[PDB]
Design a protein around this nucleic acid. Structure first.
Lengths: 113, 50, 104, 150, 128
RNA sequence: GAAAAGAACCGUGAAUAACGGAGUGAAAUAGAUCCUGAAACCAUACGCUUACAAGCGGUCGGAGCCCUUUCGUGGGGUGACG
RNA sequence: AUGGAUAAUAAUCGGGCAUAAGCAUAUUACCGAAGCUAUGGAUUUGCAAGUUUGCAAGUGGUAGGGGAGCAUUCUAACAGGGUUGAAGGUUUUUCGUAAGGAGGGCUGGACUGGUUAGAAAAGAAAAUGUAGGCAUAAGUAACGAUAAUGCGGGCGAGAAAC
């Protein structure tokens, strides 16, 4: 018998086009331009997930360096004396302390120094 | 038991959905199963036996 | 009084009455859990920073629910080769509510 | 569903506090002073630095006329200023450029160590390069900072 | 849903006074030029603008506004017209079904010519 | 449209061009281009942004401002800046 | 280290610039990848318990080879739904490794479809592919012999052309 996939043919592309919502120009309504943009958007989203984990560590390191240079120190020497002291606090918590709790940060610095 | 519980022996039925040239993702797609250009990839090719 | 505790594989900013999202724990829903892995405490007047896994410190929590995060689409594709694949992925998580930070 | 529960707080425009640092450039090398000036202007000595916010201080260099270069750079440093017309590549010298508005030396030294963005063009407006020994800001109460204490 | 109930609920046009001009043999891009000068103006300033406009698309647009005014007067029978202070709330110029003809171009080819139409809609609203 | 019961009559309009009413119907946004009627395409209203800023226009971070709310380390829209 | 000519759109340590921020040796700390590890989860073979679990080794991929499946149209049995609103169209929530499934509001006003088994006109993004509809160029080219028009009356709502 004659089988035509007419309803699901468009129901499949509606779902792929609904996530191209907010795109400039015809990248949001035209099918062959939206499909080429949604796949590239998903390709960009697969990566940048490995980069979000190394772009935040850079910010943490910069904030730790800034908070440690206020006490006449450097990030390299501070991290060396912290790692060779049995502390084991990650850079996220260390930067959160350097930003929000300067008293706790300077206490850690004076204890490891 | 009934006409609504028919079940053949395990291993007698197979996929029956395998069609060649149905998009990348089902295996055989694009250059369906004949590789790239050549005489063995043209429509109507037959192997001369002798 | 706030402490930092490594619960599953990561450190937090555990407070006295906080709700945390951690990885999937092997504990039934509505049960009590204790973590003796406090790395730093501060009871508003003194920071008792010491070696990891302070002896007497321990954070107690209660398991609220086991849920799953928002689905992320992992899409891989190589141009001009015809290779592509997309898969959905959720993350198993467990919500906990803190109900005490026993010091010493 | 915001399943993080522990985020890194970034500073906003309503929380930053800009200072009015004054820097004496009497005894200092051009690049050696410009590096620290650019770092202060960007803002990296505060443990609240967000890379996308205009944090930092405002720097007032108050002795730019008294800056010095090490080798024969005052006589062998060239600045290219192509105009856009055929055969319009003009070349200046470090000795001729400081004869008119000596602040241009420090200005062009600092501009180049900046992120080269909209944030980085907005940071250059916070730098005040005075040729004399006294600025014209007045009712701002600026504090002097020695670059050898950083 | 009950279609009679939906229609009785949507028949709220007993208050709003509007007018339509369908199947006008004029292009929409040339009437959207004169609609912008009328959109938002008072009901008499709009009439003056349409009467003294140097466009052929205003001779039939100046009487659509009069028909809209007459419809407003019909709907609001109890009350005068100058105390209300009518204006032009909304005015939209849409497209229409176009005719297709052929023009013989040089060297034995034919080009297409589309005689376009347009639909005009106007609502008045009152200040009171 | 089940069946023409296919809009008598009134008003604007030069007009039996069109429309607004009034009657038919369960429906007139079923009015003869007439069952439902999508997409491309063309417009109007509202909310957020945009006139010193260079490139496959997206992605990851990120204020501010608008709606909703089991009240939330809840949702939706726009998004200065990196 | 120094001299030993250089090519035609404005140039170069990537740039600022550096007399060390150059070079040679030695030392320490740190940064640094999808590498390794820490946590959670999924899957393929091999080995055991059973009727999914445990351990070990893995899990980039074109031509190509193998295994499990989804949707579509129809048919055979059992069991259903619908004018108290079916299919279809538009938004929203949720579930699954994905193809996809289920529920709610609005339009719509008569069909539809679960389980097992079967068949095939069984899935488009490209073929200077075909048919219909609609944009861009754009209110742009052009309005088809440079023999020529001006005024006053007439009909008429309306006249440069009657």
């Amino acid at each position: 018998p004659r089988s035509v996939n007419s309803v699901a043919k468009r129901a499949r592309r509606k779902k792929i086009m609904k996530q191209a919502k907010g795109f400039f120009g015809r990248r949001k309504n035209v099918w062959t331009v939206a499909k080429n943009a949604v796949e590239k958007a998903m390709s960009y989203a697969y990566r940048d997930r490995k980069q979000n984990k190394r772009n935040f560590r850079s910010l943490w390191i910069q904030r730790i360096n800034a908070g440690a240079r206020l006490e006449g120190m450097s990030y390299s020497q501070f991290m060396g004396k912290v790692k060779a002291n049995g502390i084991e606090l990650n850079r996220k918590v260390l930067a959160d302390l350097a930003m929000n709790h300067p008293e706790a940060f300077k206490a850690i610095l004076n204890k490891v120094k | 038991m009934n006409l609504s519980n028919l079940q053949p022996a395990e291993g007698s039925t197979h996929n029956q959905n395998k069609r060649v040239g149905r998009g990348e993702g089902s295996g055989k797609g694009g250059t369906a199963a004949r590789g790239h250009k050549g005489a063995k990839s043209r429509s109507g090719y037959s192997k001369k036996i002798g | 009084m706030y402490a930092i505790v490594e619960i599953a594989g990561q450190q937090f900013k555990v407070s006295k009455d906080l709700k945390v999202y951690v990885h999937r724990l092997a504990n039934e829903e509505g049960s009590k859990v204790s973590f003796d892995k406090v790395l730093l405490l501060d009871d508003n007047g003194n920071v008792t920073l010491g070696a990891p896994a302070i002896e007497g410190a321990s954070v107690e929590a209660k398991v609220l629910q086991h849920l799953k995060g928002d689905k992320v689409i992992v899409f891989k594709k190589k141009r001009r080769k015809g290779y592509k694949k997309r898969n959905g992925h959720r993350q198993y998580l467990t919500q906990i509510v803190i109900e005490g930070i026993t010091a010493a | 569903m915001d399943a993080l529960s522990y985020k890194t707080i970034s500073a906003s425009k309503a929380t930053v506090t800009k200072e009015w640092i004054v820097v004496d450039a009497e005894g200092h090398n051009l690049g050696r002073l410009a590096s620290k000036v650019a770092m202060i202007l960007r803002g990296k000595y505060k443990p609240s630095y967000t890379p996308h916010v205009d944090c930092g201080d405002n720097v007032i260099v108050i002795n730019s006329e008294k800056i010095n270069l090490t080798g024969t750079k005052l006589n062998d440093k060239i600045y290219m200023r192509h105009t856009g017309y055929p055969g319009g590549q003009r070349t200046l010298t470090a000795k001729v450029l400081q004869s008119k508005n000596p602040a241009l030396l420090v200005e062009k030294a600092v501009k180049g160590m900046l992120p080269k963005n909209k944030l980085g063009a907005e940071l250059f407006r916070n730098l005040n390069v005075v040729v004399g020994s006294e600025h014209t800001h007045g009712a701002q109460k600026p504090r002097t900072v020695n670059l050898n204490d950083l | 849903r009950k279609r009679e109930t939906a229609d009785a609920r949507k028949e709220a046009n007993k208050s709003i006074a509007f007018a339509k001009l369908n199947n006008c043999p004029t292009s929409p891009r040339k009437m959207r030029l004169v609609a912008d000068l009328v959109r938002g103006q008072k009901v008499e300033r709009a009439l003056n603008i349409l009467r003294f406009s140097s466009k052929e698309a205003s001779r039939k647009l100046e009487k659509l506004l009069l028909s809209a005014i007459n419809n407003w007067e019909q709907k609001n029978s109890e009350g005068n017209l100058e105390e209300a202070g009518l204006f032009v709330k909304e005015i939209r110029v849409d497209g229409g079904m176009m005719l297709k003809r052929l023009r013989p171009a040089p060297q034995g080819r034919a080009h297409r010519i589309r005689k376009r139409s347009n639909h005009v809609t106007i609502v008045l609203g009152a200040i009171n």
